[PDB]
Amino acid sequence: LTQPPSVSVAPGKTARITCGGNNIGSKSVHWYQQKPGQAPALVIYYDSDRPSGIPERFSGSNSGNTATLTISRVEAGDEADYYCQVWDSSSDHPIFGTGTKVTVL
């Protein structure tokens, strides 16, 4: 259950955020958006579709042992931490990544 802890990017430049872990192509993923000062919200579920109120800029991808969200355009609104969630079917529990912070000028 691993990911890089932080990242930096120029505004308006598309950004990759990545979450590792063994055989995570077998299981699904759901990701969240934390800007400090409020609660997070869902941005991508089942690695393929987003709920209402979220534009097309977020498109999750799963490649074997890796997962990645792409950030087409970048502003201060989405300038936030992004979490990793994996649902377990063996011991039937949630599990989390420690998140990853984006940085602009």
Partner 1 sequence: VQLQESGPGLLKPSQTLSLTCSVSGGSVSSTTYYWSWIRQHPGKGLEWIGYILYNWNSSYNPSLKSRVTISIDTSKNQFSLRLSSVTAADTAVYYCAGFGDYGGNSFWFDPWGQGTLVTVSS
Partner 2 sequence: NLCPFHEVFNATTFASVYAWNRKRISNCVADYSVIYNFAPFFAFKCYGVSPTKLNDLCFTNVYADSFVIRGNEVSQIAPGQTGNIADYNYKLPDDFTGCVIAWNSNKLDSKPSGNYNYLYRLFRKSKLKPFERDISTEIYQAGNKPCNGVAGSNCYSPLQSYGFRPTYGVGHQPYRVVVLSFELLHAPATVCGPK
The footprint of partner 1 (CB under 8 A) covers 27-28, 30, 32, 38-42, 45-46, 51, 83, 85, 87, 89, 91-99
C-alpha closest to that of 14 among 56, 64, 46: 56
Query: In this chain, which of 23, 52, 55, 92 binds partner 2, going by CB under 8 A?
Result: 92
Least distance from C-beta 7 to partner 1, angstroms?
Answer: 15
C-alpha closest to that of 30 among 64, 73, 60: 60
Query: In this chain, which of 87, 95, 98, 103 binds partner 2, going by CB under 8 A?
Result: 87
For residue 2, give both structure tokens: 């691993």
